Amino acid sequence: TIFEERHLKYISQLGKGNFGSVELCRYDPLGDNTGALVAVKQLQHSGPDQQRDFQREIQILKALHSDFIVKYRGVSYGSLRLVMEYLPSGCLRDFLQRHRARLDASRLLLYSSQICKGMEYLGSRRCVHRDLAARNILVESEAHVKIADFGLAKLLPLDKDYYVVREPGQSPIFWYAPESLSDNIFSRQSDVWSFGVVLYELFTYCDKSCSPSAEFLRMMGCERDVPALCRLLELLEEGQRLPAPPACPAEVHELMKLCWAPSPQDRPSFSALGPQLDMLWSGSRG
Ligand SMILES: O=C1CCN(c2ncc(C(F)(F)F)c(C3=C(c4c[nH]c5ccccc45)C(=O)NC3=O)n2)CC1
């Protein structure tokens, strides 16, 4: 499923960040502005090692088939461009901030359940996302979200249930499991930890003032003579966690705290979380 680079007409820039250079394009082979809109990712000034990692990302997405994972469309020029379905409602983070006044707990629990199903499917494929965050969730419609941004995703080794990542660059440390922060260990259970942070983001409607980073930076205290990563590990080791968001049901906060168990094996699986989020979405008494 090769897309000709001359048929991809540039419309606008969706964004530029760690997730690459993403452009909204029209795939117009007839050349009449009739074609479908697509999201096109490229790595700008990308060396042969970065391009090899990109080819790997493309192959993960190509083999993924879920209604709760953004749909792979194709590749362009084998420099290399990844072609994805375009979701015009944007990221979940911005949608929650904008429609907060009319999104209730049941609607937040519906998104949580969909993310959890997508993550259960990802785990059955032995793939670790490594960057679950509201920013990396796309809105398909009012009642449908999809997991996006597979730039950090890894396929687990055939004989191991964890992946050790030795790569340069900055990490979103305030979304990361303690074993990821301390020893660069990633797994389906470190994805469960980040899912607990996604739950916290949903129930704060992604309010920037009480974001995971703003909360943890406040918890550290007034003293800043210790590097943040060392202070964050100390906080987590002594049992400090993000607080219960205002108006967050007590049972949703109980699921967050379980996702944030210090031991990866003590964290619930996406399989076990899903039916519990569905039950909470129903509004039924437990
Ligand atoms: O803010 C973010 C940044 C992380 N994120 C994301 N990262 C990468 C892609 C890519 F594969 F297209 F490159 C897409 C993606 C869009 C995007 C839709 N809106 C944006 C805005 C910015 C960047 C990418 C997209 C899409 O429609 N289909 C996709 O796969 N999304 C969710 C939005």
- The structural domains of the chain, ordered by start, are 1-86 (3.30.200.20), 87-282 (1.10.510.10)
283 annotated ligand-binding residue: no
Q: Which of 3, 13, 18, 19 to mutate to test the pocket of ligand 1 (most atoms within 8 A of CB)?
A: 19
131 is an active site residue = yes
Q: Which of 164, 153, 192, 163 has its CA nearest to residue 61? A: 153
User: Are the C-beta atoms of residues 276 and 254 closer than 8 Å to each other?
Assistant: no
Q: Is 15 marked within a binding site? A: yes
Alpha carbon 276 to its chain centroid, in Å, reads 21
Placement of tokens 């530029």 in the chain: 16
Residue 210 burial (CB count, 10 A): 18
> Are the C-beta atoms of 179 and 163 separated by less than 8 Å?
no
Q: Tell me which residue of 86, 267, 57, 32 sits closest to 151, measured CA to CA.
A: 57
